[PDB]
Design a protein around this ligand. Structure first.
Ligand SMILES: COc1ccc(-c2ccn(CC[C@](C)(C(=O)NO)S(C)(=O)=O)c(=O)c2)c(F)c1
Ligand SMILES: COc1ccc(-c2ccn(CC[C@](C)(C(=O)NO)S(C)(=O)=O)c(=O)c2)c(F)c1
Ligand SMILES: [Cl-]
Ligand SMILES: [Zn+2]
Ligand SMILES: [Zn+2]
Length: 300
């Protein structure tokens, strides 16, 4: 059959804390109708404030991707959006009782598990993809983010940390999702930060909730997490996870390839804004036969 839009089959609930705010937050994922997209809702406010997870609503990009509307914000959407992109969720309401998505274990793993436990539901409408037709590149300083045409979905990333835990390590990775599993090889990669910075970050109301329980905490010459890493290249794989979530602010899955060099949330969003504006570089496509498409999804 055609590749169909997907929503949630059952309501999902999670409790956690914001990485940056440290605030306890209740998260509720609900089914939504066709062509809704992913919409965040601050249900602690009355009336609620609803913010579509779209590039035009990105307001701040310091230490996370932040959605803004009116006077209010939804912080740190990127790991949840990465899970939703990886599983092919088109339509959902994401209710939050506070300004920041819970960090969980620092990865997209817990979201992926909660969603796959509830199950997905295909809907009677064709799933829309954005296909890259022309290269689109943005740079600032030594940072670069590029979309190139590609029959599939592929993400590559390079980091370059002048730090003894990173020098001599795997700081480049490329993941082609026709041959590598998002769930198994990307979703569990945790966020990371540096112990040196924590007093400074907290002085700025950043990382107020961060610890070895929800992040890889890197000290001057060692990783502090006594239980170790999930992947030898967990740092760069997390940057790929971040990129997938930031890219999903396009509002549809991509057919194409992303390459990032020291990119971060700010430049990811500048790439999306440039792509959207460069309309002859992309097109919206659907697939009447899942068998012939360049991307495939597991059963809902
Ligand atoms: C932002 O635009 C995106 C476009 C596509 C994907 C995407 C689509 C499908 N799949 C599943 C592949 C596969 C069944 C799998 O991973 N099973 O576990 S596979 C290796 O068997 O082909 C992915 O992973 C990732 C995405 F994340 C983002
Ligand atoms: C106990 O000392 C700590 C020091 C730092 C952190 C920490 C963790 C994550 N982050 C966000 C990373 C980043 C933007 C991201 O994952 N965004 O989605 S990243 C990898 O792209 O730099 C931070 O800023 C800071 C911590 F928890 C504890
Ligand atoms: Cl052009
Ligand atoms: Zn991250
Ligand atoms: Zn153009």
């Amino acid at each position: 059959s055609m590749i169909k839009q997907r929503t949630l089959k059952n309501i999902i609930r999670a409790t956690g804390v914001g990485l940056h705010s440290g605030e306890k937050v209740y998260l509720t994922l609900k089914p939504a109708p066709v062509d809704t997209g992913i919409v965040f809702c601050r249900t602690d406010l009355d009336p609620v404030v609803e913010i579509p997870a779209r590039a035009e609503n990105v307001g701040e990009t310091t230490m996370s991707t932040t959605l803004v509307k009116g006077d209010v914000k939804v912080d740190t959407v990127e790991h949840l959006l990465s899970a939703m992109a990886g599983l092919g969720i088109d339509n959902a309401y994401v209710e939050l009782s506070a300004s920041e998505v819970p960090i969980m274990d620092g990865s997209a793993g817990p979201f992926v598990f909660l969603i796959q436990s509830a199950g997905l539901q295909e809907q009677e409408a064709a799933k829309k993809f954005i296909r890259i037709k022309r290269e689109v590149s943005v740079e600032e300083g030594d940072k670069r983010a590029v979309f190139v045409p590609f029959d599939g979905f592929k993400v590559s990333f390079e980091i370059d940390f002048d730090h003894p835990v990173f020098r001599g390590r795997t700081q480049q990775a490329s993941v082609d999702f026709s041959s590598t599993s998002f769930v198994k090889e990307v979703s569990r990669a945790r966020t990371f930060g540096f112990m040196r910075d924590i007093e400074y970050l907290r002085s700025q109301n950043l990382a107020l909730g961060g610890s070895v329980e929800n992040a890889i905490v890197v000290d001057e010459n060692r990783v502090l997490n006594e239980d170790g890493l999930r992947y030898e290249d967990e740092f760069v794989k997390h940057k790929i996870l971040d990129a997938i979530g930031d890219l999903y602010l396009l509002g549809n899955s991509l057919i194409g390839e992303f390459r990032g060099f020291k990119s971060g949330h700010a430049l990811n969003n500048q790439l999306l804004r440039t792509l959207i504006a460069d309309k002859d570089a992309w097109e919206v496509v659907t697939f009447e036969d899942a068998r012939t498409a360049p991307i495939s999804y597991m059963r809902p």
